[PDB]
Amino acid sequence: MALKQISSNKCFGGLQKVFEHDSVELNCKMKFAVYLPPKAETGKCPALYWLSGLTCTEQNFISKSGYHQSASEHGLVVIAPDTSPRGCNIFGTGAGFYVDATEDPWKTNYRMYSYVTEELPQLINANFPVDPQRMSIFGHSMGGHGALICALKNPGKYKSVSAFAPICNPVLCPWGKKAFSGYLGSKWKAYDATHLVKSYPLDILIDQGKDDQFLLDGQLLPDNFIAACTEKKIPVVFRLQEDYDHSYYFIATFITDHIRHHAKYLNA
């Protein structure tokens, strides 16, 4: 399906683009960013999807993360969708946590789980030089939660997963309780990484800043997820990074490690 190009800027040899399309899942125009590395000039590339957190559009990650150099060198197409069909209504985040909403009025339009896992990859594969068989996913905060649950709910669909400061056990934290209450109204555990990993039938990298206010506030609960991984013998690398916070300055510091991680499992 048909795309409208919003912008294009050369960066580390490849092209950072932004596109708009008519989303079937979301019932609206939706924007997403696509980075086409040098590899995409001549061949199909593996794809890496980035999910952003609160207050983000597609612009934050593409302009502030510094992911381009490593994506260019390894030859990964990087896709960064917007976080939601509509602006924020905001004492809660007001965000929908990448679920398929079951409560009205969110019901009708907030179908971010299906958008990320089904509609968007179909669109990318039809429109860009991407290998449909090799896809990985990562993200930050609410998007870290998003990446984990997309991977864990769809075994083998993603070659690898990673996250920066993910919300690991949303059913137990205030942000998750408030979001799930609004969007899902018991349905909740199907969207909780700590629950999902316990019955998972594989390579996970997580970075967490130790001076992250939201970690200190108990929103993230990484130890619950790591413990669930350890019991299941799922190989997880969890790095607690001293004095780092929740910001894109933290993300930028470790993004190359993440791109290298995904490049390995995407056979790039």
User: Under the rule (CB under 5 A), what is the footprint of Ca ion?
Assistant: 45, 75, 96, 99, 110, 112, 212-213, 245-246, 267
Stretch that binds its own copies, among 10-18, 105-113, 223-231, 240-248 (CB under 8 A): 105-113
Find all residues with CB under 8 Å of 198, minimum gap 6, and list them: 228, 231, 232
**140 catalytic residue (yes or no):** no
Binding residues (CB under 5 A) for Mg ion: these are 145, 170, 192-193
Q: How far is the CB of 250 from Mg ion (least distance, A)?
A: 19
Q: Which is nearer to Mg ion, 116 or 193 (CB)?
A: 193
15 touches its own copies by CB under 8 A: no
**Tokens (6 digits) for 8:** 């294009």
Q: Is the dihedral of CA 63, 67, 69, 74 positive or negative?
A: negative
**141 catalytic residue (yes or no):** yes
Residues forming beta bridges with residue 111, ordered by sequence position: 100
**246 catalytic residue (yes or no):** yes
Residue 152's nearest CA partner among 100, 207, 192, 110 is 192
The CA distance from 39 to 46, in Å, is: 10
132 touches its own copies by CB under 8 A: yes
Q: How far is the CB of 204 from its own copies (least distance, A)?
A: 16
The CA distance from 219 to 186, in Å, is: 20
Q: Do residues 37 and 71 touch, judged by C-beta distance below 8 A? A: yes
Instruction: Residue 145: name its binding partner from Mg ion, Ca ion, its own copies, none (Cβ under 5 to 8 Å by kind).
Output: Mg ion
230 touches its own copies by CB under 8 A: no
Number of residues counted as binding its own copies (CB under 8 A): 27
Find all residues with CB under 8 Å of 90, minimum gap 6, and list them: none
Phi, psi (5° rounding) for residue 77? -80, 130
Interface residues with its own copies (CB under 8 A)?
24-25, 100, 102, 104, 107-108, 111, 114, 118-119, 121-122, 132-133, 153-157, 159, 186-187, 190, 199-201
